[PDB]
Scaffold this motif. Structure first.
Motif, PDB file in Angstrom:
ATOM      1  N   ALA A   1      45.763  37.592  46.067  1.00  0.00           N
ATOM      2  CA  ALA A   1      44.650  37.696  45.100  1.00  0.00           C
ATOM      3  C   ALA A   1      44.687  36.510  44.067  1.00  0.00           C
ATOM      4  O   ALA A   1      43.607  35.958  43.683  1.00  0.00           O
ATOM      5  CB  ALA A   1      44.726  39.039  44.328  1.00  0.00           C
ATOM      6  N   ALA A   2      45.895  36.051  43.713  1.00  0.00           N
ATOM      7  CA  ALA A   2      46.002  34.986  42.691  1.00  0.00           C
ATOM      8  C   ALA A   2      45.459  33.663  43.297  1.00  0.00           C
ATOM      9  O   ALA A   2      44.713  32.849  42.674  1.00  0.00           O
ATOM     10  CB  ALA A   2      47.481  34.708  42.245  1.00  0.00           C
ATOM     11  N   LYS A   3      45.730  33.488  44.624  1.00  0.00           N
ATOM     12  CA  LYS A   3      45.198  32.320  45.272  1.00  0.00           C
ATOM     13  C   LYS A   3      43.745  32.477  45.521  1.00  0.00           C
ATOM     14  O   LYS A   3      43.033  31.412  45.383  1.00  0.00           O
ATOM     15  CB  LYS A   3      45.838  32.099  46.638  1.00  0.00           C
ATOM     16  CG  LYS A   3      47.397  31.689  46.440  1.00  0.00           C
ATOM     17  CD  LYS A   3      48.258  31.560  47.667  1.00  0.00           C
ATOM     18  CE  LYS A   3      49.435  30.527  47.368  1.00  0.00           C
ATOM     19  NZ  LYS A   3      50.603  30.635  48.380  1.00  0.00           N
ATOM     20  N   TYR A   4      43.243  33.600  45.890  1.00  0.00           N
ATOM     21  CA  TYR A   4      41.770  33.784  45.887  1.00  0.00           C
ATOM     22  C   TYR A   4      41.219  33.296  44.566  1.00  0.00           C
ATOM     23  O   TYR A   4      40.060  32.762  44.565  1.00  0.00           O
ATOM     24  CB  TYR A   4      41.436  35.222  46.127  1.00  0.00           C
ATOM     25  CG  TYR A   4      41.370  35.643  47.645  1.00  0.00           C
ATOM     26  CD1 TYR A   4      40.365  36.479  48.087  1.00  0.00           C
ATOM     27  CD2 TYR A   4      42.246  35.158  48.590  1.00  0.00           C
ATOM     28  CE1 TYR A   4      40.315  36.939  49.420  1.00  0.00           C
ATOM     29  CE2 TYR A   4      42.164  35.592  49.960  1.00  0.00           C
ATOM     30  CZ  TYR A   4      41.177  36.444  50.322  1.00  0.00           C
ATOM     31  OH  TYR A   4      41.101  36.912  51.669  1.00  0.00           O
ATOM     32  N   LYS A   5      41.751  33.908  43.487  1.00  0.00           N
ATOM     33  CA  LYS A   5      41.131  33.651  42.169  1.00  0.00           C
ATOM     34  C   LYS A   5      41.025  32.128  41.922  1.00  0.00           C
ATOM     35  O   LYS A   5      39.992  31.625  41.415  1.00  0.00           O
ATOM     36  CB  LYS A   5      41.976  34.338  41.083  1.00  0.00           C
ATOM     37  CG  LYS A   5      41.422  34.075  39.695  1.00  0.00           C
ATOM     38  CD  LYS A   5      42.149  34.999  38.728  1.00  0.00           C
ATOM     39  CE  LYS A   5      41.347  35.214  37.376  1.00  0.00           C
ATOM     40  NZ  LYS A   5      41.856  34.240  36.445  1.00  0.00           N
ATOM     41  N   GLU A   6      42.117  31.442  42.225  1.00  0.00           N
ATOM     42  CA  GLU A   6      42.189  29.975  42.088  1.00  0.00           C
ATOM     43  C   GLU A   6      40.965  29.344  42.831  1.00  0.00           C
ATOM     44  O   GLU A   6      40.161  28.491  42.210  1.00  0.00           O
ATOM     45  CB  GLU A   6      43.568  29.396  42.620  1.00  0.00           C
ATOM     46  CG  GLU A   6      43.625  27.840  42.741  1.00  0.00           C
ATOM     47  CD  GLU A   6      44.775  27.428  43.567  1.00  0.00           C
ATOM     48  OE1 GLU A   6      44.643  26.346  44.219  1.00  0.00           O
ATOM     49  OE2 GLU A   6      45.784  28.245  43.529  1.00  0.00           O
ATOM     50  N   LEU A   7      40.686  29.737  44.111  1.00  0.00           N
ATOM     51  CA  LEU A   7      39.605  29.226  44.926  1.00  0.00           C
ATOM     52  C   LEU A   7      38.224  29.797  44.579  1.00  0.00           C
ATOM     53  O   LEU A   7      37.310  29.425  45.251  1.00  0.00           O
ATOM     54  CB  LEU A   7      39.952  29.576  46.415  1.00  0.00           C
ATOM     55  CG  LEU A   7      41.194  28.796  46.829  1.00  0.00           C
ATOM     56  CD1 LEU A   7      41.562  29.320  48.207  1.00  0.00           C
ATOM     57  CD2 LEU A   7      41.048  27.248  46.935  1.00  0.00           C
ATOM     58  N   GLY A   8      38.120  30.749  43.652  1.00  0.00           N
ATOM     59  CA  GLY A   8      36.755  31.248  43.287  1.00  0.00           C
ATOM     60  C   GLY A   8      36.304  32.404  44.140  1.00  0.00           C
ATOM     61  O   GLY A   8      35.122  32.685  44.232  1.00  0.00           O
ATOM     62  N   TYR A   9      37.253  33.116  44.779  1.00  0.00           N
ATOM     63  CA  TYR A   9      36.869  34.264  45.579  1.00  0.00           C
ATOM     64  C   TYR A   9      37.507  35.553  45.048  1.00  0.00           C
ATOM     65  O   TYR A   9      37.539  36.489  45.819  1.00  0.00           O
ATOM     66  CB  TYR A   9      37.455  34.113  47.069  1.00  0.00           C
ATOM     67  CG  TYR A   9      36.891  32.963  47.739  1.00  0.00           C
ATOM     68  CD1 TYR A   9      35.901  33.109  48.696  1.00  0.00           C
ATOM     69  CD2 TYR A   9      37.277  31.623  47.428  1.00  0.00           C
ATOM     70  CE1 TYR A   9      35.262  31.934  49.365  1.00  0.00           C
ATOM     71  CE2 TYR A   9      36.697  30.419  48.144  1.00  0.00           C
ATOM     72  CZ  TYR A   9      35.719  30.632  49.089  1.00  0.00           C
ATOM     73  OH  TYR A   9      35.094  29.547  49.735  1.00  0.00           O
ATOM     74  N   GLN A  10      38.176  35.626  43.932  1.00  0.00           N
ATOM     75  CA  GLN A  10      38.619  36.997  43.634  1.00  0.00           C
ATOM     76  C   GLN A  10      37.401  37.954  43.256  1.00  0.00           C
ATOM     77  O   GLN A  10      37.402  39.215  43.488  1.00  0.00           O
ATOM     78  CB  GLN A  10      39.864  36.996  42.791  1.00  0.00           C
ATOM     79  CG  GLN A  10      40.833  38.129  43.009  1.00  0.00           C
ATOM     80  CD  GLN A  10      41.279  38.574  41.553  1.00  0.00           C
ATOM     81  OE1 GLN A  10      42.376  38.211  41.064  1.00  0.00           O
ATOM     82  NE2 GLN A  10      40.342  39.246  40.814  1.00  0.00           N
ATOM     83  N   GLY A  11      36.303  37.381  42.788  1.00  0.00           N
ATOM     84  CA  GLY A  11      35.071  38.187  42.708  1.00  0.00           C
ATOM     85  C   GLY A  11      35.041  39.020  41.436  1.00  0.00           C
ATOM     86  O   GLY A  11      36.011  39.772  41.276  1.00  0.00           O
TER      87      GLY A  11
END
Ligand code: HEM
Length: 153
Positions: free
Chosen positions: A143-153
């Protein structure tokens, strides 16, 4: 942070999975797709499968279960020092496969159900709690890497 004892619970059960990777991967994916049909829709490769028997007959689906479980086992055996192994995984599942984090929760539930079904004497409640911790740690880090890429939503 899991303790050493919690890791040992995890990896004890996991060594049992390693005796029959493909059966377990099949049961997990089928349970995910039956429990949460939206997940199936994410795989253009399997979206033709309409019944559980067609799932269980599919060689391609059993191949993909082995891919998923070998990558998971590589992460669990790092005992939390898994940044090199999670990076590519999160990158591809956020940006190419488009998988929400919630569906990572779903497949974790399917993994805990299948391990309880197949290995109940190694998967009592201590080990279940531990494996839950382990899977939470994977999901936190992806989830932390999602957030970095703009996908944690
Ligand atoms: C325990 C969690 C998971 C692990 C360890 C995992 C592992 C992998 C690996 C190693 C690959 C191929 C390499 C890559 O594309 O990065 C892959 C592909 C893929 N995964 Fe996952 N996965 C997980 C969860 C899921 C979930 C929950 C979904 C969908 C609901 C999914 C959807 C996909 C799709 C669509 C592909 C591409 C398959 C293809 O068309 O070849 N992943 N996964």
């Amino acid at each position: 942070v899991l303790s050493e004892g919690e890791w040992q619970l995890v990896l004890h059960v996991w060594a049992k999975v390693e005796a029959d990777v493909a059966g377990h991967g099949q049961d997990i994916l089928i349970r995910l797709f039956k429990s949460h049909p939206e997940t199936l829709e994410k795989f253009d490769r399997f979206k033709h499968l309409k019944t559980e028997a067609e799932m269980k007959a599919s060689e391609d689906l059993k191949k993909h279960g082995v891919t998923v479980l070998t990558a998971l086992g590589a992460i669990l055996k790092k005992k939390g020092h898994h940044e090199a192994e999670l990076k590519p995984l999160a990158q591809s599942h956020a940006t190419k496969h488009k998988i929400p984090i919630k569906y990572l929760e779903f497949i974790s539930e399917a993994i805990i159900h299948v391990l309880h079904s197949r290995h109940p004497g190694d998967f009592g409640a201590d080990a279940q709690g531990a494996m839950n911790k382990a899977l939470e740690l994977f999901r936190k880090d992806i989830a932390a890497k999602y957030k970095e890429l703009g996908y944690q939503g």
